[PDB]
Design brief:
296 residues; cytoplasm; Helicase, Ruva Protein, domain 3; globular; phosphatidylinositol transfer activity; 5-stranded mixed sheet; Phosphatidylinositol Transfer Protein Sec14p; 12 helices; protein transport; binds 4-fluoranyl-~{N}-[(4-pyrrolidin-1-ylphenyl)methyl]benzamide; 2 domains; 5 strands; alpha/beta; phosphatidylcholine transporter activity
Length: 296
């Protein structure tokens, strides 16, 4: 069973100081929840994505409500049916990316100090007017599921191997330099769909969320509203302004942080520059496993 060979390719435990209910750090309750949830799903169909990390994430999202989680899994597998996201890496081909990378820079670059894939999103620079000249919202969404599936089947295992421990989550950094009320309305549609996909079909994959170059007001307002969000989803959220450099450098090494954000990592501009790169442990022989290297 080669599927089995794949979960032994990389470290299976989250670090011991990781949040509760994460692989390797389970109390008895959590263990029993997992065993008898896996039962319900295995009962009558469901033979893949029944691994511990997958299920413990769903549960961690529905606060351990085996019943509710059984459904998130069911709705997820139902969406995978329809969207065709198994085999999405085969079918979909985002050929327009070199044309439109500049009008919505999204790119993964290296790892954080805990091994997470770092995900840079310069939403502030967005230009949907130009972007729609060559592509659609539904394609943009497909691409995100492509980058997500690529995160799940390639980036995370190699990050696990390079970090010495399971890595389940990513470190997102959003540059709002250039954002406007105007831009915010034009991306509203897309961000709503992307979030729905993220939260309900990729539970617990957000490990850190940095907003940088946020307007001066916004950062202040969030510190007072903080009590509304869960205390856990506040340890991940960070909201910064003009001077973001070395607050980033506290969670990402200067060797892994791109130069434009203060670090010293750099990419060869002749081969498409930062916006078209995909450097990381998942492109490193030391850490690519029995799954092969990821597509492009
Ligand atoms: O980072 C993840 N979720 C958090 C997130 C979701 C959406 C967005 N935006 C989309 C448009 C605006 C910002 C930013 C972060 C994640 C989700 C699934 C994965 F497999 C890996 C990582």
């Amino acid at each position: 069973q080669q599927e089995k060979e794949f979960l032994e390719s990389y470290p299976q435990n989250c670090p011991p100081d990781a949040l509760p209910g994460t692989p390797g750090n389970l109390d008895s309750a959590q263990e029993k929840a997992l065993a008898e949830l896996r039962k319900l799903l295995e009962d009558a169909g469901f033979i893949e994505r029944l691994d511990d990390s997958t299920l413990l994430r769903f549960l961690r999202a529905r606060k351990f409500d085996v019943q509710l989680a059984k459904e998130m899994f069911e709705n997820c597998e139902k969406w995978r049916k329809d969207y065709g996201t198994d085999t999405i890496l085969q079918d979909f081909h985002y050929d327009e990316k070199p044309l439109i990378a500049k009008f919505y820079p999204q790119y993964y670059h290296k790892t954080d100090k805990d091994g997470r894939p770092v995900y840079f999103e310069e939403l502030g620079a967005v230009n949907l007017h130009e972007m729609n000249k060559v592509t659609s919202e539904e394609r943009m969404l497909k691409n995100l599921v492509w980058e997500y599936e690529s995160v799940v089947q390639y980036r995370l295992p190699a990050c696990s191997r390079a970090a010495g421990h399971l890595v389940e989550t990513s470190c997102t950094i959003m540059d709002l330099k250039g954002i406007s009320i105007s831009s915010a309305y034009s991306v509203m549609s897309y961000v709503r769909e992307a979030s729905y996909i993220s939260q309900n079909y990729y539970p617990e994959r957000m490990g850190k969320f940095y907003i940088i170059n946020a307007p001066f007001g916004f950062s202040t307002a969030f510190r007072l509203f903080k009590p509304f969000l869960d205390p856990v989803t506040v340890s991940k959220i960070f909201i910064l302004g003009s001077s973001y450099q070395k607050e980033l450098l506290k969670q990402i090494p200067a060797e892994n942080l791109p130069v434009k954000f203060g670090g010293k990592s750099e990419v060869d501009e002749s081969k498409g520059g930062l916006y078209l790169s995909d450097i990381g442990p998942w492109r490193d022989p030391k850490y690519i496993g029995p799954e092969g290297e990821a597509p492009e």
